[PDB]
Amino acid sequence: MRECISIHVGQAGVQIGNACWELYCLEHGIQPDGQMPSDKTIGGGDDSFNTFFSETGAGKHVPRAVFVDLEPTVIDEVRTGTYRQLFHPEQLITGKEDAANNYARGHYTIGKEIIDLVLDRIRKLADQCTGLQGFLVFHSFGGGTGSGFTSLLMERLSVDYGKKSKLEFSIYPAPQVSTAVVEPYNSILTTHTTLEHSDCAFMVDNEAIYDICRRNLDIERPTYTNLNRLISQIVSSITASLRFDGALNVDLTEFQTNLVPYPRIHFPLATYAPVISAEKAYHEQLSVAEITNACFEPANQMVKCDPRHGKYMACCLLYRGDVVPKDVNAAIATIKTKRSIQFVDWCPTGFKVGINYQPPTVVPGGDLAKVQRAVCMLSNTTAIAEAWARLDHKFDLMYAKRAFVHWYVGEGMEEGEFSEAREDMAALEKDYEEVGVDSVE
Amino acid sequence: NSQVTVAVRVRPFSKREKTEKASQVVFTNGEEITVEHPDMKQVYSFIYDVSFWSFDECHPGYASQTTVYETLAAPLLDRAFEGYNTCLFAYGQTGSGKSYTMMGLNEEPGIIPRFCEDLFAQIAKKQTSEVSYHLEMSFFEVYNEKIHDLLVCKGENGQRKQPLRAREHPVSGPYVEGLSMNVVSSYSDIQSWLELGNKQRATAATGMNDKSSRSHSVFTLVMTQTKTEVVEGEEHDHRITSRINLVDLAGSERCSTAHSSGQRLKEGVSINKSLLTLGKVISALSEQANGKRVFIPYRESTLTWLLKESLGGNSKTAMIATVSPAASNIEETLSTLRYATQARLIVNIAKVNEDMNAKLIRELK
Amino acid sequence: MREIVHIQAGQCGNQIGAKFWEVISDEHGIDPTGSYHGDSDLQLERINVYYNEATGNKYVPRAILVDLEPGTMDSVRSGPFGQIFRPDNFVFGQSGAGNNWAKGHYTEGAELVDSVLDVVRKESESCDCLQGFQLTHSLGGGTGSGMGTLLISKIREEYPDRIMNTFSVMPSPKVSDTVVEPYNATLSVHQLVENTDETYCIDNEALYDICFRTLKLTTPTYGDLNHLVSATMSGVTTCLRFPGQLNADLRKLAVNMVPFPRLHFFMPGFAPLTSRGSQQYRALTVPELTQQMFDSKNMMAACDPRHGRYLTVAAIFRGRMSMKEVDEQMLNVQNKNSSYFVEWIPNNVKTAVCDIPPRGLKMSATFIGNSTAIQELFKRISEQFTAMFRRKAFLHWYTGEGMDEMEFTEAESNMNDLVSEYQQYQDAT
Ligand SMILES: CC(=O)O[C@H]1C(=O)[C@@]2(C)[C@H]([C@H](OC(=O)c3ccccc3)[C@]3(O)C[C@H](OC(=O)[C@H](O)[C@@H](NC(=O)c4ccccc4)c4ccccc4)C(C)=C1C3(C)C)[C@]1(OC(C)=O)CO[C@@H]1C[C@@H]2O
Ligand SMILES: Nc1nc2c(ncn2[C@@H]2O[C@H](COP(=O)(O)OP(=O)(O)OP(=O)(O)O)[C@@H](O)[C@H]2O)c(=O)[nH]1
Ligand SMILES: Nc1nc2c(ncn2[C@@H]2O[C@H](COP(=O)(O)OP(=O)(O)O)[C@@H](O)[C@H]2O)c(=O)[nH]1
Ligand SMILES: Nc1ncnc2c1ncn2[C@@H]1O[C@H](COP(=O)(O)OP(=O)(O)O)[C@@H](O)[C@H]1O
Ligand SMILES: [Mg+2]
């Protein structure tokens, strides 16, 4: 059977993970105590789907997850919260010191002393599987942990496991909003390392969702307990085809093939169209077309990057609920007719489609409404080169004076590693340009 | 102005490398050192002030020991005999050919002995009994930002290397409290001091070599020149002094490709910090020479603090980097090429020298 | 478990620390007997940060008290919260320093420092994971400036990879409280610059202007001024004790705040501060906190940042808030007041949020800024310094205790260089 390991690293990972397993438990009928009263009421069924939850003989269902912070605060919310009786107590809080938003701290100094435990519990989880399909790493650029520890880990797994899909779900740093001075360095450092080991890194920025919740959900002052519920849904659609029935099922090695033309341009975006409040759940039809067109609106992207400044290479559309295929085909044609959406000449197909019959579920206490159908888009565009350039210019402005560097050297980093990582992102800026040049003869 | 002469020595292939047939990655086109990875991907190009192509003895521009000396060091001697200060830094990884360039062997001698003997020869030529000279030298090290004396008789016990401290004299600038100084008249009485110091200099076995350098080293030669005026009034009062500093620097050493812990880690961090501050100083001095006045962070390291008066004002500074051309050490050579550089390094792609079998565009033309 | 050591030296540190432990204890629900009488369970999970435990569910603070006169200590003992401290940590001699930095550094303090370190080496080894140190002292005097910087040098050699956070009341511009004030401060800055990682510069005249304008206090005493400093001390390290959305610590702030190793003198502040009558007329929101934070009239440093540029600042929040409000508001400052910020640091702001506010306030905010306007404090002292040293006004009381004139000139240059290093970034090309 199909089995995936969800890893959450740092604070941006955990607070997302707490929202995900909140949702995974509801879709499958699991209480926070790991129990499933419906199955003993039913007498059958594998709704306790062994993709995300392992099962013991006593009826308790235990999630396939490991998450670690290198500080004990955020996990300790889980070891004393409402989901304590769900998880395995082997959660890593060997975080007596934090990474101080330093790569050099999550990659070396405190980058070790914690990793041998992490690889062991994973190896235990993998030894309980009848077949793996890949990993799901939830982290954040900008920190030391989500940047450094994520890189060291991705290096080791590429040795022990090798050819297994590794899908990252990371918080991309925003152009204006930012909660740290040294974000540009930490992003360029792990981006250099994770490039040769990852397979597809799904980008999200916190600045776009602030506007989505404003314009669509009509929330005027949201916090991270809202941004992380939407991110919980993007993942469910990706991993829905491994749990529930469907017409056109999509495995995890299918994103790796259709959305990654060349091995270094595996940075796609994401979004979720029918993000509406309960009130606006009326007054609208929410058909396949109205939902599918919204995914191509530049204002409904979960990353701050205008795709109209670039060209599309590949787009995977994952539908859920009461959806009929002809409605998808009619809609995808309407998009290729519109001229503001330019595709590369070397990809005349462009689109992938996936359809499922299990609609999304409503986390109670939430802001999203109940719908019959829901859509998740994943796109690879040349516009994101603009965002790589913003980081490189911030890098150069404050590296020309060697600012904040003595905090990284103080941990074991060399002065040259900054250059070695700035040159690889100047080659990436060209590869995104070379791809976008239409061919000639 | 006071510019900084950066130079590079490309060592030739050794016997081990020729037997293993280690291929060449560092090439020259005259005014450029180029690095072409065996994958034929991003090709790096560096433009320095002086390039020393010691690669093959029959290539044009072959950089002999005498060539290197006359190119870099002798102007520092001519400057010292004017009443100004000079500093020569030596940087390189282990096995790159740094000691060959600075000291030399029993034969093919290097900058240290060449400079010393030429200095003494010019002193002899300028001796008159109207003009007199006096030479006094010292030799010390820097280890985890602590100063140690290398010319002190020490026994064997725990924590014996007593640390000295830096102090700032209002006129003469910074100096070391308690550092010894010894008078000299030739090179045969320098060699026995240097051989005493280089045995007390800190070393430790690591993944690069079983005897690597883990502390910065400073050899300072202080010249005093006395003159007398014929007015029957200035009795041996015209004094002018100069300082020649020769600084052996330790390598960066990445702690990623060398799993270490404890004292070696601390040593690496300290060395790294020192090198970073030195780079900031040299770049700021270059900007100062090019006109834009700036602030030199001398005070962020013992080395720069002690060498303050020898890297500023009316002075001369040279930095000799040493790099190996083998493909077995891309990361270190590129690290040493990216370090020693004041201008901007350029990168391109140049696998298209195989357009059509030695292009042969002669036909097209 | 992150842990902090508190060292209180002089009459200013102890009279501040006595409110500090009276502010942290009232948070974690500890009463003067060391016993717990709280309501919430989050008060105990991270009690190990500042307090150690005792036998009968009693809690003894990890405080170390230092002085050269017993008057300070008897006030703490015969006081509100004196029965909680460890009596074996009340270290003191007699015959104070006479406002002589020499006496506290070389002559008298050296006969007492070895007893102080015996306590520090004891408390630290009793901890699981030490995060840093915490010193409250004063410049302008002998003990705080001499004994403090002496303990800094010794602890730094023993624990160089830990933080050394130092709260220090700097000398005021208009009216002094000692005559040899610049002699003692310049020699302290020579030690703090090289050895500390973050120091928070406080000026009493700034605190008087706060009590008069904002709080409308007519007769403020020293028990009130320190009731403001205790707030800043508590806000900085709150994210080590209580949970939150975007957490932080002492080291995360030092990284973002210290671009170069020497520029770690900060301009602190605290919100929301108001009068007892005008509390009914103010809406307590995140923007109303930000406008108060970045106001020149709520800085405790007595230096106008509008005469300089911010290299990098920090803003620690506490309460149930929304993270869009924080990011949007701290952005609006950089875009509006673009000239008071550095061009080669794109986002000059660090942010942190905790979910547990103060005893009776829905929210609060703590501010840390590193600005070039601290240039004026050191430039001012040097003019006072050379005006005295040029004629040796009082230099014979310092040389008589084992010091030279050369040591006075070192402290002046290192101060004047730092003055320039800050000025190097008040200029654009
Ligand atoms: C109904 C009401 O508004 O009561 C407030 C109050 O009137 C005001 C004036 C309080 C009051 O402030 C003062 O009276 C004061 C006097 C001198 C110096 C500084 C403050 C208050 O004392 C302050 C006190 O706040 C706290 O207790 C915090 O926990 C504070 N700790 C202590 O005050 C404290 C000290 C010793 C023993 C027990 C508690 C604190 C500050 C920072 C971090 C942690 C805790 C509170 C609610 C008030 C009073 C009591 C009037 C304010 O104080 C602070 C720093 O929050 C001033 O603005 C706030 C809130 C109000 O405006
Ligand atoms: N979407 C989202 N982002 C978060 C959340 N928490 C933190 N972040 C992001 O994380 C970024 C900073 O990196 P951190 O996640 O704090 O780094 P870290 O993994 O915690 O590593 P340390 O800082 O050493 O603890 C900020 O830009 C935030 O936007 C969250 O709950 N949701
Ligand atoms: N904020 C504050 N500052 C104080 C207090 N008491 C003394 N000071 C400051 O401390 C300085 C006196 O130095 P001090 O250390 O007490 O002298 P010492 O006792 O001989 O070491 C003065 O400049 C005061 O500004 C106080 O209660 N609060
Ligand atoms: N110009 C040169 N010609 C030939 N060999 C050289 C030259 N320069 C250096 N070498 C070789 O380099 C070696 C010195 O390397 P080593 O001293 O171990 O490195 P380091 O100088 O960094 O300590 C010598 O054995 C010598 O054969
Ligand atoms: Mg964190």
Residue numbers in the entry:
A (entry chain E): 1 to 441
B (entry chain N): 391 to 755
C (entry chain I): 1 to 429
Quote the passages of the study that discuss this structure, keeping the authors' original sentences.
KIF14 is a microtubule-based motor protein with essential roles during cell division. KIF14 belongs to the kinesin-3 family of motor proteins. As all kinesins, KIF14 possesses a highly conserved catalytic motor or head domain that contains nucleotide and microtubule binding sites, and where ATP hydrolysis is coupled to the generation of mechanical work. Here we report the near-atomic resolution structures of twenty KIF14-microtubule complexes corresponding to five distinct KIF14 constructs in four nucleotide conditions mimicking four key steps of the ATP hydrolysis cycle.
Construct K755 includes the neck-linker and part of the first coiled coil heptad repeat of the CC1 domain. The other four datasets correspond to KIF14 dimers forming a two-heads-bound intermediate with each of the two heads in a distinct conformation (MT-K755-ANP, MT-K755-AAF, MT-K772-ANP, and MT-K772-AAF). Different from the Apo and ADP states in the AMP-PNP and ADP-AlFx states, the MT-K755 and MT-K772 helically averaged cryo-EM maps show a density connecting the motor domains along a protofilament. This density can be well-fitted with the undocked neck-linker of a motor domain positioned further toward the microtubule plus end (leading head) and part of the coiled coil domain connecting with a docked neck-linker of a motor domain positioned more toward the microtubule minus end (trailing head). The neck-linkers connecting density and the combined densities in the motor domain in the helically averaged cryo-EM maps strongly suggests that the KIF14 dimer in the AMP-PNP and ADP-AlFx states binds to the microtubule in a two-heads-bound configuration with leading and trailing heads in distinct conformations. The new maps with separated densities identify the leading head with the undocked backward pointing neck-linker as the one in the open conformation and the trailing head with a docked neck-linker as the one in the closed conformation. In the case of the MT-K755-AAF and MT-K772-AAF maps, there are also ADP-associated densities in both leading and trailing heads but AlFx-associated densities only in the trailing head. In the leading head, the situation is similar to the one observed in the monomeric MT-K735-AAF and MT-K743-AAF-O cryo-EM maps where densities that could have been attributed to the AlFx group are near the noise level. Construct K755 does not include the full CC1 domain but includes part of the first heptad repeat. Our results then show that this incomplete heptad, although insufficient to induce dimerization in solution, is able to do so when many motor domains are bound in close proximity in the microtubule lattice.
